[PDB]
Amino acid sequence: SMEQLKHCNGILKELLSKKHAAYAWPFYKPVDASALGLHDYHDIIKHPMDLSTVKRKMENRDYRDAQEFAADVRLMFSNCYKYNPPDHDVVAMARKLQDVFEFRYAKMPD
Ligand SMILES: COc1ccc2c(c1)C(c1ccc(Cl)cc1)=N[C@@H](CC(=O)Nc1ccc(N3CCC([N+](C)(C)C)CC3)cc1)c1nnc(C)n1-2
């Protein structure tokens, strides 16, 4: 399953690519709560995640298996859904990028 981790690296590169940039861009770097005017972000979200952090962990070889990679990507999306109202534009962007992630992850070789 070095081959599964290589497939995961391929997914990450697709999520960061210009093809999906219209809805992926909020997830590129950690949420900057003071830059967005959010006073309570870190009171609600105890474990932040974003694509730059997933990339650093992949480059460092911190992932023991594909399931750990999926847990981080799904955490990133879940924090967005937890913090925001369900009709919010950033939740619509999260769902569009999650559609791409779940479809590619499901096609991973066993
Ligand atoms: C680099 O920019 C970023 C990075 C991370 C996140 C965000 C933006 C964005 C983001 C927002 C909109 C769009 Cl279209 C796209 C993204 N959202 C942030 C979260 C955020 O800010 N939410 C937010 C929600 C509601 C309000 N209020 C506006 C005033 C209203 N009023 C009644 C008039 C008083 C009440 C409701 C304020 C803030 C975020 N969350 N995850 C990620 C990733 N993000």
From Swiss-Prot:
Result after altering V31A: Abolished binding to histone H4 acetylated at 'Lys-12' (H4K12ac)
Domain Bromo: 3-108
Transmembrane feature ranges: none
Entry's localization field: Nucleus; Chromosome
Effect of N84A: Abolished binding to histone H4 acetylated at 'Lys-12' (H4K12ac)
Additional remark text: Some specific inhibitors of BRD2 that prevent binding to acetylated histone are promising therapeutic molecules for the treatment of cancers or inflammatory diseases. ABBV-744, a small molecule, has been tested on tumors with success: ABBV-744 antiproliferative activity is mainly restricted to cell lines of acute myeloid leukaemia and prostate cancer and is able to displace BRD4 from chromatin. GSK046 (iBET-BD2), which specifically inhibits the second bromo domain, is a promising therapeutic small molecule for the treatment of inflammatory and autoimmune diseases.
Quaternary structure annotation from Swiss-Prot or TrEMBL: Homodimer. Interacts with E2F1. Interacts with (acetylated) STAT3; promoting STAT3 recruitment to chromatin. Interacts with CTCF; promoting BRD2 recruitment to chromatin. (Microbial infection) Interacts with herpes virus 8 protein LANA1.
Similarity remark: Belongs to the BET family.
Function statement: Chromatin reader protein that specifically recognizes and binds histone H4 acetylated at 'Lys-5' and 'Lys-12' (H4K5ac and H4K12ac, respectively), thereby controlling gene expression and remodeling chromatin structures. Recruits transcription factors and coactivators to target gene sites, and activates RNA polymerase II machinery for transcriptional elongation.
Record text about domains: The first bromo domain specifically recognizes histone H4 acetylated at 'Lys-12' (H4K12ac). It also specifically binds histone H4 acetyl-methylated at 'Lys-5' and 'Lys-12' (H4K5acme and H4K12acme, respectively). The second bromo domain recognizes and binds histone H4 acetylated at 'Lys-5' and 'Lys-12' (H4K5ac and H4K12ac, respectively).
Name assigned to this protein: Bromodomain-containing protein 2
Originating organism: Homo sapiens
Part of the whole protein covered: 348 to 455 of 801
